[PDB]
Structure formats: structure tokens, C-alpha cells
């Protein structure tokens, strides 16, 4: 399964969440941003590695990072 990590450089925009195609990210409460929100990645077992969230991360570099690793039927998105 791919590894998704949310760094402290998160602004709680929720854009990466509204971008995940397989419900892998969610918005949990935090205190280091004025939006009092920090995206978490509860179900990285459904991550396909599309990296759509990164294309939706507006912070310098990338607060959300998808490290493509092991590949499974879900990770490879195989309906076979």
C-alpha cells in the first residue's frame, strides 16, 4: 500500500480530502492553524497512488505526501 503522510505544513484547507478518489483522507481537529483542522490519512489501505491530493495541496512544497510503495489489488485498482 502507498504511504500518505500529512506534515505540520497543513492549513486545513480540506482540498486534498475533497480530492481523494478512494476516501483515504479525512479532516481531524488541530491547533497549529487558524482553521483549527489538519487532514489525517486514516485508510491508506485504499490509496491507489493517484497523487490527486498533492495536486490539491496549496502549501509550499507539499503538506500531504504519497510515497508509492507495495502494490495490492486495491493499490493497483484491479477489478479482475
Amino acid at each position: 500500500s502507498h504511504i500518505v503522510k500529512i506534515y505540520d505544513t497543513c492549513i486545513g484547507c480540506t482540498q486534498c480530502v475533497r480530492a481523494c478518489p478512494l476516501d483515504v483522507l479525512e479532516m481531524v481537529p488541530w491547533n497549529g492553524c487558524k482553521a483549527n483542522q489538519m487532514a489525517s490519512a486514516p485508510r491508506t489501505e485504499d490509496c491507489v497512488g493517484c497523487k490527486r491530493c498533492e495536486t490539491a495541496c496549496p502549501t509550499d512544497f507539499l503538506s500531504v505526501r504519497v510515497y508509492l510503495g507495495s502494490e495490492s489489488t486495491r493499490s493497483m485498482g484491479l477489478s479482475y
Binding site: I11, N31, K34, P58, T59, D60, F61
Partner: protein, 61 residues
């Protein structure tokens, strides 16, 4: 707290597209927000974003 609104500060963040480059301080959240200094840039990163919230230590007037 933070560089005066409108002040141009040299970005010190290493992984910043605007490193060694200057930008105007749009605002500085006076709370305990990790990165409070909002800095705007005429140039835009590869993504297309032209702004970013940098920490007080990441900015040098």
C-alpha cells in the same frame, strides 16, 4: 508580532520556490499559529501558487 504588513522579507525556508527571493508580508496571525507570516510573491511556484504562510524564522526583512 512578525514583520510589518507590506514589508518585503527574504524567504529562508529551504524547500520554498521563493527561497533567497523576496515577498511582501500580507499579514501575521498574532495567535500561536505555527507559520503566521503570510507572504505574497509576484513569481508563482510550479503549482501556480504565488503566496505561502512562512514562520517568523523563515522570513528576514
Amino acid at each position: 508580532v512578525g514583520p510589518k504588513r507590506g514589508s518585503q522579507v527574504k524567504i529562508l525556508r529551504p524547500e520554498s520556490y521563493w527561497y533567497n527571493q523576496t515577498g511582501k508580508v500580507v499579514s501575521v496571525d498574532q495567535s500561536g499559529i505555527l507559520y503566521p507570516v503570510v507572504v505574497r510573491f509576484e513569481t508563482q511556484n510550479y503549482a501556480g501558487v504565488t503566496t505561502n504562510n512562512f514562520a517568523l524564522d523563515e522570513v528576514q526583512p
